[PDB]
Amino acid sequence: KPCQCVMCGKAFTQASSLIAHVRQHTGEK
Ligand SMILES: [Zn+2]
DSSP, X not given: OOEEOTTXXXXXXXXXXXXXXXXXXXXXX
């Protein structure tokens, strides 16, 4: 499901690509 990077508001048509993106504001592993 298309979701939004809760951090910056960037939305993507692919949820998993989103998750990778949203992790960027959170931090590395
Ligand atoms: Zn973002």
